Amino acid sequence: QAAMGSQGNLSAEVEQATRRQVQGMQSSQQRNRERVLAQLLGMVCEVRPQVHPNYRV
Amino acid sequence: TFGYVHGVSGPVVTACDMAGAAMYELVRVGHSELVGEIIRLEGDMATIQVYEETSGVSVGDPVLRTGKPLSVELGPGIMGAIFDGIQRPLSDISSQTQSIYIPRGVNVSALSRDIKWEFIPSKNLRVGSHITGGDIYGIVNENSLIKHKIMLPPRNRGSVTYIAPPGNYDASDVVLELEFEGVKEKFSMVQVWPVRQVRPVTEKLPANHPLLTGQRVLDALFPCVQGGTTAIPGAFGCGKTVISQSLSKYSNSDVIIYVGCGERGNEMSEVLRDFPELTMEVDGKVESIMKRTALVANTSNMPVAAREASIYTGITLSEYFRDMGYHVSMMADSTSRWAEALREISGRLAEMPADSGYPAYLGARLASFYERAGRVKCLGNPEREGSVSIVGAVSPPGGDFSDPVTSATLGIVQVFWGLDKKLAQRKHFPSVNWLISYSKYMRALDEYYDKHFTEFVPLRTKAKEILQEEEDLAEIVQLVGKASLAETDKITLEVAKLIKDDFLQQNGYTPYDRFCPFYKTVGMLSNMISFYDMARRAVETTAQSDNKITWSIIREHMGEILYKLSSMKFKDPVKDGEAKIKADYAQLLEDMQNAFRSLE
Amino acid sequence: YLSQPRLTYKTVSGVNGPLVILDHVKFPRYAEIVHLTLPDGTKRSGQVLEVSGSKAVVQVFEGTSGIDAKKTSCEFTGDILRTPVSEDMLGRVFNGSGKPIDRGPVVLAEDFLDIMGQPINPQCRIYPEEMIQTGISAIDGMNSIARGQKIPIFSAAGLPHNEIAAQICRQAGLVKKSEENFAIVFAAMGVNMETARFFKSDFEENGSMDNVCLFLNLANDPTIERIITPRLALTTAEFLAYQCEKHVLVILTDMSSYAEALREVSAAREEVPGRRGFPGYMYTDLATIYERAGRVEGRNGSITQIPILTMPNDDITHPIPDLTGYITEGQIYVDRQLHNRQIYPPINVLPSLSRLMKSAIGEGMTRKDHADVSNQLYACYAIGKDVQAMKAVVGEEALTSDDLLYLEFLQKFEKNFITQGPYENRTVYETLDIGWQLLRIFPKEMLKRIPQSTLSEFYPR
């Protein structure tokens, strides 16, 4: 019985910790996700035509 | 001038549009310009064995052609460096990349073109005098141990027009120039030489000098000549590579060349870590043995076909130093890996296997590879005298000795040594079988051994007789329980046990016996044979007349003496001068005599 | 960076066994990876093996089944197989192909590395000489395993090799005495799931699941992905060693299944056979699996391998044990006879051998009398076995005092030295003392493998 009580206590503690880290990760995301998706759009905009390197006629 | 890829299958690449082709002509393939060699041609098509793993070549890739076959570079700076199968100096790559990986097919020069070296002229050659190919004209000092010598390459002669004066010059700096018909042609200190072509010689010569062997065994029992051929087949576990290390470490030769065929980089790790530590002197100052050794590393992770090349480059290097007028002992490790690689290139090229899956021409190839050896007379006015010996290592497929490769190596070689699994299981280092092993050079060395030592034959004959008698009586005593045995049998088997556990057993890693000289070995064997003979005559006479000397009572009398005869190997010759050693041997001999007189 | 739109061809000109041929393929890329869309929609995968002209043979990882020459499609990547690596993968579980098993996500892959890897520069190698603390007397003292080495264990069916693996991964340490820990890596090779469950449970018993990179593969799964799994695990080990400065205890299991799968692939490809019908390049393949280990300059990390294997029919000359012995330095060879004698840990001490005594032991590391003690013990055990064989027929009456002494020494050796138990970690010093106590039965005279100085120094106690 004491073991299950302590297990509940520790589960609550680690749940609080995990929520704290979740807050940290979402803060890290919102820091620069806009610049990141801007970089993604800059990348996908390119086309760069190129024939196959060693094709010969 | 160029070709395009058509297909690939691991280490082989079929190509197209390559009508201008010749087998054994170097080539380059892909955007990584991996080096290769033509092996098959038909129509405009061809095939190339590639010396680098081929994940990264697709169809249609360029195929550049050159006009020269596989070749290597000879000159100063080679000594003390490490090379791979196709002659890349590992130090230069590690410096250039500053990384711990091999990039696929790097184009580095074999010999650095940025280090200057002092040069000495011939002192007897003047502008206008005539010279023939094979004549030394310059001396460069690679290090204090070896004075590199350069000679005019073959197929060259005529009267010189200019020689570089004494001074410091690099490889690019032209040094020599000759004309023979009216055409001037320059010559540098580096020599381009095809690998598959034998270097010409003047004439062949027999063996006269013994090749030094560190172990007491394989020197007083199964010796090898300085210039002969040896084989060391042995199953796994024994790790005969350590025997190869012992051979390279200590030897009366001048230059030692080790090559690797599909072993682990750890073997390299021991040898490279240890050789700088080891040091020895000959005529004065002491120098590390790394200055007198060259390495050709090739681990199994390397490409398959590269191994054949590696062996061929090894024999080429040893041949060049043979022309130098020296003695060079090489030991090649795991030739079975070469045989497997040849099997694999053939099987991928889809020929018809002859025996055990291996090709139909392994025997001739191995015979030709071993044939490049012997003691010969060089071709030059300074009239050098060169010599080369080979120590090939065989890896039985599972310890079975009926494999075709083992039979071929036995049929070609002159000296054969045996390794037994149970002896290595005994921790009986080294595991010489002394039953199937034989040599064919004792007769040639008899002249030397008589001229210089004047007593080895009775010792050898009696030792062989004792070993044969013990081998005969082993299973006999097993199957009769040592019950009805004469005293002669007991003395024979126990002295044989003494010879086995003292004279044959030799831990080459304990400091006091890392190396043993010939004089100490013959002293040991003299002491043992004298003990055996005196015991034999004593027991014979006493049994004949009365009061038979059984083994138990003589053993009680001489337990102390046989204990000293067992512990006498504890000498440490580096800490013990030869004079003191022979004095102690005479002292033990007279002790044994005194005890035998005390009995009778 | 590859800005090239992908391709897909439907020209399937045939199927034979686990192989598929694609005609009209444009500019094949050798050693490629392709994906296959079955008509019902199931996904499949493979790698291109051979290319010639406008044809491309391709082997399928999960096996040929249901493929239709007119309906299926195949699309081309243009790059060799590259696997996702990640340091956060520790504490996770995946199948052979790498997909999650525990309802975990697609791993966020710190880099993409070559599955085939790359060799290591020779000159960029440093020899390892640090002795590992295993806690087994038969290893520490006799066949001591050092860092940067790859000793396997030769075991047969029914032997307790799994418990030996458990002990060696649990009681790992350092003989030379900050904190230490070993990043376990393990991949199954089609073994029955009961052993997998036992290993999982023991790994929670260790209490460090956060350092357990685990992979799985069961017998019922397709056979041919077993060719891929160990290479992926080794790539992970490379990433965790030479990029994160960590020590990794890589361990495998059941290489016989790997050999069998490679054999089946080779038979499908009708290459030139060898001994017992095995492939010729099985040796080079095993070399690419094993020689990826050690430690290099500029890095404090290291790679240790324990690739335990099955040993059919208990035959030492069977090709797989032979070739594994050649490619490696050491061996253990757990014994069936000892396990039938009801003794644990049942490791035969004689056939075992370790080649790292040359630098792992000696003065300044453990002692100035380790090597001669071990040599004397080996010699005494071997001669004890020989006199036991002699006694098996001759009878005790005709023997001598030396024979009885050797038999008693053998009895003491087996009852005390080998008997170690399941959870009793023992130090090097205790094993040396135990060996000296065992050796004390013989008087000093007959000890022919000890120098005079050490014998005078240590024996009289």
Side-chain angles (χ1 to χ4, degrees), chain B residues 370-387:
Chain B
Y370 273 30
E371 164 55 16
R372 283 156 187 265
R375 193 264 296 264
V376 303
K377 152 64 67 166
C378 294
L379 193 147
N381 287 323
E383 60 94 23
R384 280 90 68 197
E385 185 177 353
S387 185

Side-chain angles (χ1 to χ4, degrees), chain C residues 367-407:
Chain C
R367 211 66 60 74
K368 57 168 49 55
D369 59 358
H370 180 279
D372 63 358
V373 159
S374 68
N375 266 30
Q376 184 68 91
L377 191 57
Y378 262 65
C380 298
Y381 186 49
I383 302 298
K385 178 55 59 57
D386 213 328
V387 65
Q388 156 54 19
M390 171 165 288
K391 181 181 181 294
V393 61
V394 175
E396 54 258 19
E397 291 91 12
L399 301 183
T400 186
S401 314
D402 296 332
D403 291 331
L404 190 44
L405 293 172
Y406 274 56
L407 190 137

Side-chain angles (χ1 to χ4, degrees), chain B residues 8-9 264 300-301 396 425, chain C residues 50 121 281 291 326 329 350:
Chain B
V8 298
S9 309
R264 282 73 51 76
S300 58
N301 292 135
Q425 200 55 85
Chain C
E50 177 52 38
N121 291 331
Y281 47 94
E291 282 184 348
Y326 287 100
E329 294 307 335
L350 183 62

Side-chain angles (χ1 to χ4, degrees), chain B residues 166-409:
Chain B
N168 294 6
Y169 297 97
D170 53 57
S172 85
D173 288 336
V174 171
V175 173
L176 180 65
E177 194 175 355
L178 275 74
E179 72 90 11
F180 79 111
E181 190 276 331
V183 175
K184 328 300 300 306
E185 167 52 26
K186 292 168 191 288
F187 293 98
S188 78
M189 302 335 307
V190 62
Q191 289 204 28
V192 177
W193 183 247
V195 193
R196 290 182 205 275
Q197 179 47 239
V198 182
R199 188 78 62 82
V201 298
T202 315
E203 80 278 12
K204 318 293 192 58
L205 213 52
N208 64 345
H209 188 281
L211 198 168
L212 189 142
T213 290
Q215 298 331 113
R216 301 194 305 281
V217 301
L218 299 175
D219 197 357
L221 317 174
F222 299 96
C224 168
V225 295
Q226 195 178 9
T229 311
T230 59
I232 59 171
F236 64 91
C238 185
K240 64 213 161 303
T241 60
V242 304
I243 296 287
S244 306
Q245 298 317 69
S246 70
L247 266 295
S248 74
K249 193 186 288 298
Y250 303 145
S251 166
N252 60 0
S253 61
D254 310 338
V255 179
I256 292 294
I257 306 174
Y258 181 76
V259 62
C261 192
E263 301 86 21
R264 282 73 51 76
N266 311 322
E267 276 80 17
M268 161 266 268
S269 186
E270 291 91 4
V271 68
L272 270 292
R273 175 175 73 86
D274 298 353
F275 280 7
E277 202 281 335
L278 275 298
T279 196
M280 61 79 71
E281 69 272 17
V282 295
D283 59 357
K285 296 186 288 296
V286 66
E287 285 80 59
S288 167
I289 64 170
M290 181 49 201
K291 282 171 182 180
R292 61 184 302 275
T293 193
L295 271 289
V296 175
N298 190 356
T299 185
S300 58
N301 292 135
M302 295 298 102
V304 177
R307 311 152 187 247
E308 170 199 339
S310 88
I311 308 314
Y312 273 22
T313 78
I315 192 66
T316 304
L317 274 296
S318 57
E319 179 55 30
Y320 177 81
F321 275 12
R322 196 264 288 285
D323 211 3
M324 197 178 165
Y326 279 81
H327 313 140
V328 182
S329 287
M330 161 205 288
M331 72 291 291
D333 194 4
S334 309
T335 63
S336 304
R337 305 293 179 276
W338 181 37
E340 293 179 353
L342 187 67
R343 167 190 57 191
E344 285 215 0
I345 208 65
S346 65
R348 195 65 63 90
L349 187 53
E351 290 84 4
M352 183 278 288
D355 188 300
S356 298
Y358 290 12
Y361 48 90
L362 62 84
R365 201 73 56 97
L366 209 55
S368 75
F369 158 57
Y370 273 30
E371 164 55 16
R372 283 156 187 265
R375 193 264 296 264
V376 303
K377 152 64 67 166
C378 294
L379 193 147
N381 287 323
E383 60 94 23
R384 280 90 68 197
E385 185 177 353
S387 185
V388 285
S389 86
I390 302 298
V391 186
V394 168
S395 188
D400 189 359
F401 290 84
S402 57
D403 179 73
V405 173
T406 62
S407 79
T409 56

Side-chain angles (χ1 to χ4, degrees), chain B residues 1-5 15-16 18 27-30 48 61-65:
Chain B
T1 69
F2 295 152
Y4 303 136
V5 174
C16 70
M18 196 187 166
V27 291
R28 294 177 178 90
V29 66
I48 304 96
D61 291 1
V63 176
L64 192 143
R65 299 168 39 207

